[PDB]
Design a protein around this ligand. Structure first.
Ligand SMILES: N[C@@H](CCC(=O)N[C@@H](CSc1ccc([N+](=O)[O-])cc1[N+](=O)[O-])C(=O)NCC(=O)O)C(=O)O
Ligand SMILES: N[C@@H](CCC(=O)N[C@@H](CSc1ccc([N+](=O)[O-])cc1[N+](=O)[O-])C(=O)NCC(=O)O)C(=O)O
Lengths: 225, 225
């Protein structure tokens, strides 16, 4: 059973939690709460680059979020059928990875910049990413982004859709296909379960999360928008 | 055949030029010298997310640097031989990607910020990245990072090493295996050629470059370290 080393919040580990749940894969979590728990980890040398996320899976101590997702997508057949499909999946994931990235430092921002950051994110979504994914689905008319079947690109897009809707409830208005897309993917048994209450899915990160990360890593004390 | 659309400089495209070159793949380049070219590109809509780099290859208009690199590594067998090896390659690439990432804005940085960033990068190279790779090479004693054969990870690490040494010629001091690694990988025919004069390899980005980028995209004027 894979073990996820990160803090007790979303951050970069959330997308990992999603993919594993989507693959219907049971997993354990290890949360960093104290600076000494971390330093103890550095001492063991299990974090190749001194960072987290880190995931022990199949005898590996994988670090680097994209390497972790890539491996999981591949291991569970959520990475397409050939190089071409994977290329499309990677191009799509890169988009949502950028979009979600804009919300990763939100909890570390100040009320002042949070207001600005929210504006920036939503705008990027309605003017850049939603149009792009809405277009893919339209010109393809299929039920999924790639290969007419559930793939990691679909799962990454849904998570990003929901993160934006958490900021602007009506952000999907004007994107009928994406709306239908949301219903389909959200009803997949595994994803449906991950969305139901009581899952390991994490809520939006808050001060407690931020504060913990700062004590543990001694950084990001002044994250800029 | 493949056509790389980007500015006439390094930026995020340099890594792509590196991999293609190492794989023995000739390519064309289209530079953006005017705010016009861009606005015209947006019209055609060949930029899924309105961004560059973008590469036309095998009938695709691929955007998102990593998706492009991933595809190229896969197509020309520089991505290992199984999901496990791919994971290690993606993990290594993650590190060099962050390391080179820290230099990607360097040219846009102020006179003083550059000296701040310079030390930062060097700090990361000697205290975080170089050690990690030195350790990998030491643990299995092979000439290549993974699968005892040239991989994308070897190519990315070599580019990263040079970018660092361009800022500090003695950055590899204390990393003998990496020093031996530098010579070995550089000796490989395709790479030796890419490193020889007259190749499509880009020099350190100058003020001219920064100005052009700022023009074509009307962004990146206040880039912080
Ligand atoms: N490229 C690596 C980057 C990993 C990384 O930056 N890890 C951070 C924690 S995550 C993180 C750290 C800061 C913020 N932030 O918003 O300030 C958001 C997140 N996040 O995961 O969303 C870390 O361990 N830092 C310690 C160090 O570098 O010394 C990856 O994708 O996995
Ligand atoms: N995730 C995408 C990100 C692409 C991206 O940011 N592209 C930029 C140009 S590259 C770039 C732009 C600015 C700086 N900078 O240092 O300021 C460095 C680079 N770079 O490639 O290294 C762009 O097109 N921007 C226009 C827009 O957002 O509308 C990828 O990796 O390809």
């Amino acid at each position: 059973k894979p073990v996820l080393y990160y803090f007790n919040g979303r951050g970069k580990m959330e997308s990992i939690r999603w993919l594993l749940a989507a693959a219907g894969v049971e997993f354990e979590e290890v949360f960093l709460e104290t600076r000494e728990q971390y330093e103890k980890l550095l001492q063991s040398g299990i974090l190749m680059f001194q960072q987290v996320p880190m995931v022990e899976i199949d005898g590996m101590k994988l670090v680097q979020t994209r390497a972790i997702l890539n491996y999981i997508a591949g291991k569970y057949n959520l990475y397409g059928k050939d190089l071409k499909e994977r290329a499309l999946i990677d191009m799509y994931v890169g988009g949502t990875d950028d979009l979600m990235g804009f919300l990763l430092s939100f909890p570390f921002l100040s009320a002042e910049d949070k207001v600005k950051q929210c504006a920036f994110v939503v705008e990027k979504a309605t003017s850049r990413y939603f149009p792009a994914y809405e277009k893919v689905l339209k010109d393809h008319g299929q039920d999924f982004l790639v290969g007419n079947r559930l793939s990691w690109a679909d799962i990454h897009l849904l998570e990003a859709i929901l993160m934006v809707e958490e900021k602007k409830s009506d952000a999907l208005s004007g994107f009928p296909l994406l709306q239908a897309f949301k219903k389909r993917i959200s009803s997949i048994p595994t994803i449906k379960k991950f969305l139901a209450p009581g899952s390991k899915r994490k809520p939006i990160s808050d001060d407690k999360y931020v504060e913990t990360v700062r004590r543990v890593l001694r950084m990001y004390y002044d994250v800029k928008p």
